[PDB]
Design a protein around this motif. Structure first.
Motif, PDB file in Angstrom:
ATOM      1  N   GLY A 123      45.701  46.304  41.061  1.00  0.00           N
ATOM      2  CA  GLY A 123      46.045  45.684  42.324  1.00  0.00           C
ATOM      3  C   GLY A 123      47.316  44.875  42.163  1.00  0.00           C
ATOM      4  O   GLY A 123      47.966  44.894  41.119  1.00  0.00           O
ATOM      5  N   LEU A 124      47.671  44.184  43.245  1.00  0.00           N
ATOM      6  CA  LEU A 124      48.877  43.374  43.314  1.00  0.00           C
ATOM      7  C   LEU A 124      48.507  41.933  43.633  1.00  0.00           C
ATOM      8  O   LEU A 124      47.532  41.663  44.339  1.00  0.00           O
ATOM      9  CB  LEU A 124      49.867  43.889  44.384  1.00  0.00           C
ATOM     10  N   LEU A 125      49.310  41.005  43.129  1.00  0.00           N
ATOM     11  CA  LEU A 125      49.213  39.598  43.512  1.00  0.00           C
ATOM     12  C   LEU A 125      50.574  39.181  44.059  1.00  0.00           C
ATOM     13  O   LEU A 125      51.542  39.030  43.310  1.00  0.00           O
ATOM     14  CB  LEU A 125      48.723  38.731  42.354  1.00  0.00           C
ATOM     15  N   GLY A 126      50.649  39.050  45.380  1.00  0.00           N
ATOM     16  CA  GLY A 126      51.903  38.745  46.038  1.00  0.00           C
ATOM     17  C   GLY A 126      52.298  37.289  45.876  1.00  0.00           C
ATOM     18  O   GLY A 126      51.487  36.375  46.007  1.00  0.00           O
ATOM     19  N   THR A 177      52.009  38.184  30.694  1.00  0.00           N
ATOM     20  CA  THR A 177      52.245  39.403  31.444  1.00  0.00           C
ATOM     21  C   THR A 177      52.762  40.467  30.483  1.00  0.00           C
ATOM     22  O   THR A 177      53.587  40.185  29.610  1.00  0.00           O
ATOM     23  CB  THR A 177      53.193  39.131  32.627  1.00  0.00           C
ATOM     24  N   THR A 178      52.270  41.698  30.637  1.00  0.00           N
ATOM     25  CA  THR A 178      52.449  42.744  29.641  1.00  0.00           C
ATOM     26  C   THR A 178      53.011  43.990  30.315  1.00  0.00           C
ATOM     27  O   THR A 178      52.489  44.414  31.360  1.00  0.00           O
ATOM     28  CB  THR A 178      51.075  43.074  28.994  1.00  0.00           C
ATOM     29  N   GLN A 211      41.247  36.414  36.980  1.00  0.00           N
ATOM     30  CA  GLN A 211      39.803  36.283  37.113  1.00  0.00           C
ATOM     31  C   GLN A 211      39.433  36.124  38.581  1.00  0.00           C
ATOM     32  O   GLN A 211      39.938  35.230  39.258  1.00  0.00           O
ATOM     33  CB  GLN A 211      39.330  35.065  36.324  1.00  0.00           C
ATOM     34  N   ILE A 212      38.539  36.979  39.066  1.00  0.00           N
ATOM     35  CA  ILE A 212      38.108  36.961  40.460  1.00  0.00           C
ATOM     36  C   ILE A 212      36.588  36.858  40.507  1.00  0.00           C
ATOM     37  O   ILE A 212      35.894  37.663  39.889  1.00  0.00           O
ATOM     38  CB  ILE A 212      38.572  38.214  41.231  1.00  0.00           C
ATOM     39  N   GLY A 213      36.072  35.902  41.266  1.00  0.00           N
ATOM     40  CA  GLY A 213      34.642  35.848  41.511  1.00  0.00           C
ATOM     41  C   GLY A 213      33.857  35.070  40.476  1.00  0.00           C
ATOM     42  O   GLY A 213      34.384  34.504  39.514  1.00  0.00           O
ATOM     43  N   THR A 214      32.543  35.060  40.701  1.00  0.00           N
ATOM     44  CA  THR A 214      31.577  34.342  39.877  1.00  0.00           C
ATOM     45  C   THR A 214      30.359  35.229  39.647  1.00  0.00           C
ATOM     46  O   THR A 214      29.685  35.599  40.613  1.00  0.00           O
ATOM     47  CB  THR A 214      31.122  33.051  40.565  1.00  0.00           C
ATOM     48  N   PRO A 215      30.047  35.618  38.404  1.00  0.00           N
ATOM     49  CA  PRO A 215      30.865  35.428  37.206  1.00  0.00           C
ATOM     50  C   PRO A 215      32.203  36.141  37.372  1.00  0.00           C
ATOM     51  O   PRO A 215      32.371  37.022  38.218  1.00  0.00           O
ATOM     52  CB  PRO A 215      30.027  36.066  36.094  1.00  0.00           C
ATOM     53  N   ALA A 216      33.157  35.758  36.542  1.00  0.00           N
ATOM     54  CA  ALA A 216      34.494  36.305  36.659  1.00  0.00           C
ATOM     55  C   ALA A 216      34.491  37.818  36.464  1.00  0.00           C
ATOM     56  O   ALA A 216      33.825  38.356  35.571  1.00  0.00           O
ATOM     57  CB  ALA A 216      35.407  35.668  35.613  1.00  0.00           C
ATOM     58  N   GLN A 217      35.287  38.489  37.284  1.00  0.00           N
ATOM     59  CA  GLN A 217      35.672  39.879  37.104  1.00  0.00           C
ATOM     60  C   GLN A 217      37.169  39.861  36.830  1.00  0.00           C
ATOM     61  O   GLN A 217      37.946  39.400  37.671  1.00  0.00           O
ATOM     62  CB  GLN A 217      35.358  40.688  38.360  1.00  0.00           C
ATOM     63  N   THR A 218      37.577  40.304  35.651  1.00  0.00           N
ATOM     64  CA  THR A 218      38.982  40.240  35.280  1.00  0.00           C
ATOM     65  C   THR A 218      39.649  41.564  35.619  1.00  0.00           C
ATOM     66  O   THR A 218      39.232  42.625  35.138  1.00  0.00           O
ATOM     67  CB  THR A 218      39.150  39.910  33.797  1.00  0.00           C
ATOM     68  N   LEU A 219      40.666  41.488  36.474  1.00  0.00           N
ATOM     69  CA  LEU A 219      41.484  42.625  36.855  1.00  0.00           C
ATOM     70  C   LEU A 219      42.920  42.364  36.424  1.00  0.00           C
ATOM     71  O   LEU A 219      43.379  41.222  36.407  1.00  0.00           O
ATOM     72  CB  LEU A 219      41.443  42.882  38.367  1.00  0.00           C
ATOM     73  N   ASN A 220      43.646  43.435  36.120  1.00  0.00           N
ATOM     74  CA  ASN A 220      45.039  43.328  35.687  1.00  0.00           C
ATOM     75  C   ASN A 220      45.931  43.645  36.877  1.00  0.00           C
ATOM     76  O   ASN A 220      45.998  44.794  37.322  1.00  0.00           O
ATOM     77  CB  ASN A 220      45.298  44.260  34.515  1.00  0.00           C
ATOM     78  N   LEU A 221      46.583  42.610  37.402  1.00  0.00           N
ATOM     79  CA  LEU A 221      47.333  42.719  38.646  1.00  0.00           C
ATOM     80  C   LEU A 221      48.837  42.685  38.385  1.00  0.00           C
ATOM     81  O   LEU A 221      49.326  42.072  37.433  1.00  0.00           O
ATOM     82  CB  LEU A 221      46.948  41.601  39.616  1.00  0.00           C
ATOM     83  N   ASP A 222      49.570  43.340  39.274  1.00  0.00           N
ATOM     84  CA  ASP A 222      51.030  43.357  39.269  1.00  0.00           C
ATOM     85  C   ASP A 222      51.509  42.198  40.136  1.00  0.00           C
ATOM     86  O   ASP A 222      51.383  42.236  41.364  1.00  0.00           O
ATOM     87  CB  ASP A 222      51.472  44.709  39.821  1.00  0.00           C
ATOM     88  N   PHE A 223      52.028  41.145  39.500  1.00  0.00           N
ATOM     89  CA  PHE A 223      52.539  39.981  40.211  1.00  0.00           C
ATOM     90  C   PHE A 223      53.868  40.353  40.863  1.00  0.00           C
ATOM     91  O   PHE A 223      54.812  40.766  40.179  1.00  0.00           O
ATOM     92  CB  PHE A 223      52.746  38.807  39.251  1.00  0.00           C
TER      93      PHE A 223
END
Length: 330
Positions: A124-127, A7-8, A22-34
């Motif tokens: 986005g966010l990851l709750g 985490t950065t 990583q979301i989906g197939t093929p992966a889509q990489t998004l940077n989320l706020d945990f």
């Protein structure tokens, strides 16, 4: 199973932290706020109102062969800072640091508030709070951790946030090389859906420890440390020239000051926040007035152990049948 992801900080002030997902197939990489203070995994998407996207990476469910629209499901969330977002829902495969959940609810934004649009670094966010807070209607959905936890080696995740540096979120194991001393565990109330606990007190700088119960939440999605007005006044009284500014919206202090540390209690243990973790820099570009990292919770309704506090510790979010929190120095 386990997962481990770096985490950065999004900026030079550690205003928030982003973690690749990583979301989906093929992966889509998004940077989320945990965010251990909320329970929705939501993303900027190909469905987001175009004028409300300004540099974010988007999830495009139509390009994911594993995405499925969750029929009839919508979501809408408002956060304690006044920001908000809403949309529809897919299920898809989500991986964090090598840990994979199939059928995770991925909440695709149709609308986001201006503060999200204006932050190009957060996709986005990851709750990571309790699933009772998830906003999906009419069928509430589970968090990533809730979905993963039966598969994990141990039903835990850990937050190791850096000061002006990267850190780590681990799932399913406790890296015993990542902290010093022991981990002190403390009771959690899940009644409000948060990782809510009671600190045993505080000290300012080298001052005497004040034993007093401070109920609050461990919230990786909040930047600052929000505490009762009495505590916050005692801290800033040790900074020459510091004052509460109604126009700015909190305590400010001369940028030339040297800030004292702040210690909080976890049982009989003590976590020390160095003074420079409490400096959030000029209130506006070029100002010599700086914004404080410890602020009053009086207008919130709850005390919040946000990133200022959590980054001084190695923090265990223990999702056993009776959840607990653990804190170690590092």
């Amino acid at each position: 199973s386990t997962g481990s992801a770096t985490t950065t900080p999004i900026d030079s002030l550690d205003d928030a932290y982003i973690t690749p997902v990583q979301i989906g197939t093929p992966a889509q990489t998004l940077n989320l706020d945990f965010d251990t203070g909320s329970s929705d995994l939501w993303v900027f998407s190909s469905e987001t109102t175009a004028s409300e996207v300004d540099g974010q990476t988007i999830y495009t469910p139509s390009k994911s062969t594993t995405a499925k629209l969750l029929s009839g499901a919508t979501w809408s969330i408002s956060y304690g800072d006044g920001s908000s977002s809403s949309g529809d829902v897919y299920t898809d495969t989500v991986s964090v640091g090598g840990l994979t959940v199939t059928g995770q609810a991925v909440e695709s934004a149709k609308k986001v508030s201006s503060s999200f649009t204006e932050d190009s670094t957060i996709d986005g966010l990851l709750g990571l709070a309790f699933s009772t807070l998830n906003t999906v209607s009419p069928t509430q959905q589970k968090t990533f951790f809730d979905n993963a936890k039966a598969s994990l080696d141990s039903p835990v995740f850990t937050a190791d946030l850096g000061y002006h540096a990267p850190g780590t979120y681990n799932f399913g194991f406790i890296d015993t090389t990542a902290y010093t001393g022991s981990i002190t565990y403390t009771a959690v109330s899940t009644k409000q859906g948060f990782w809510e606990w009671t600190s045993t007190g505080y000290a300012v700088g080298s001052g005497t420890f004040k034993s007093t119960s401070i109920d609050g939440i461990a919230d990786t999605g909040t930047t600052l440390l929000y505490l009762p007005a009495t505590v916050v006044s005692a801290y800033w009284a040790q900074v020459s020239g510091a004052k509460s500014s109604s126009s700015v919206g909190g305590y400010v202090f001369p940028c030339s000051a040297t800030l004292p540390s702040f210690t909080f209690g976890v049982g009989s243990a003590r976590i020390v926040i160095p003074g420079d973790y409490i400096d959030f820099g000029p209130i506006s570009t070029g100002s010599s007035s700086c914004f404080g990292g410890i602020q009053s919770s009086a207008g919130i309704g709850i005390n919040i152990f946000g990133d200022v506090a959590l980054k001084a510790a190695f923090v265990v979010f223990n999702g056993a049948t009776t959840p607990t929190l653990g804190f170690a120095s590092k």
